[PDB]
Amino acid sequence: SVLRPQLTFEHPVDNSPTPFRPVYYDEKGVRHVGEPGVHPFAERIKAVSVPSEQLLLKTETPYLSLVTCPLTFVDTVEDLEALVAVLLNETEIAVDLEHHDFYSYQGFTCLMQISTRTQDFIVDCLKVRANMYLMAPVFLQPNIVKVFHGAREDVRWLQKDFGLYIVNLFDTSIALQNLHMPHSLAFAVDHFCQVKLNKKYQTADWRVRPIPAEMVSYAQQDTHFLLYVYDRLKQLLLNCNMLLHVFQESRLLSLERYEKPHLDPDVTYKQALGRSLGGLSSSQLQVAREIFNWRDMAAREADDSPSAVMHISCVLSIATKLPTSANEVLKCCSPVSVAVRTNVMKLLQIVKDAIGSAL
């Protein structure tokens, strides 16, 4: 990879096999250091009720035209601050996040999309990453409903990257599940707005700056229709209290905590290699486990995902073939990565030690 935004981070990411410890800010902008296995706003979220006017049967406010709708790309602190001030006047906002996971161990949030009743925003989470805590007054606000579609990943990403926590989250995917119907975003936007979403950039590289026009359009359309979908879902839940239930299930989701990826040195390799372990000798299983565990350690050290360090087929290839020279380790898996070529002797020592260990 050309891009490596982690190098620009104000604080280096801790990929160590130790529990995640949150560093978060309150609505006053006061920094706090949290505790492992403790969500720092659990007592707040459990003590906060859904705004009563948000449980009333109301008429929908249509989404605007994409042609004349204001779109703002926010990538400075002042711009982020001005946006936060705009959001503190709303009773509901639509939020989405774009993420990167290949050239990062834990992964990091790349972009944040926000739509209000009258406009759209795209926030550069990479550029203003160190200042995202300024959004806490909005995300902690009990009178502001934060609408997300399929918030399981988002809730954790907000915590991992920014120390951001949602008070009065409403998940539109949970709403669709409770109505017993298809619950993807593309489905919701098509069923209520009669618009077909792009889907082309679902797997794009969100680290690219500048963001091309088509990607800006994709990012904007992910939240632009969401408050209308929210209005439509409220009406459906109020007649056939089910609306209240969805708010209660959404609150339970906002109570989830981010947990760093865990390497179980005796389990994870089995889960990733599965039935491919069949037909391997005791020594080949030892090399399979040991190299997979090396791969994870190297990924944590280089701040890359295990797949960026070495393809899984390459782990199986070394386990099967048992290479006994540096060149044989290199030749085992044709597209030789940078991490593998530099630690070729350590991978070779794993093989040599496993065939040495038994016979």
Numbering used by the authors: 176 to 415, 423 to 541
From the paper:
The TbRRP6CAT construct crystallized in a sea urchin-like form composed of very thin needles. TbRRP6CAT crystal structure was refined at 2.4 Å resolution to final Rfactor/Rfree of 16%/22%, respectively. The model covers residues 176 to 541 and includes 185 solvent molecules. The polypeptide chain was clearly defined by the electron density, except the residues 416 to 423 that could not be modeled. TbRRP6CAT shares 41% and 40% of sequence identity with the corresponding catalytic core of the yeast and human proteins respectively and, as expected, conserves their overall architecture. In the TbRRP6CAT crystal structure, these residues exhibit a configuration similar to the mutated active sites of the human and the yeast structures, even in the absence of metal ions or nucleotides. The apo TbRRP6CAT catalytic site shows only moderate movements of the side chains comparing with Mn/AMP bound Rrp6 structure, and a water molecule that is coordinated by Y393 and E273 residues could represent the hydrolytic water. The electron density map revealed the presence of a disulfide bond between the residues C496 and C515, linking α-helix 3 and the end of α-helix 4 of the HRDC domain.
The exosome is a 3′–5′ exoribonuclease complex that plays a central role in numerous pathways related to RNA processing and degradation, both in the nucleus and in the cytoplasm. The EXO domain consists of a classical α/β fold composed by a six-stranded β-sheet flanked by α-helices and the HRDC domain is constituted of six α-helices.
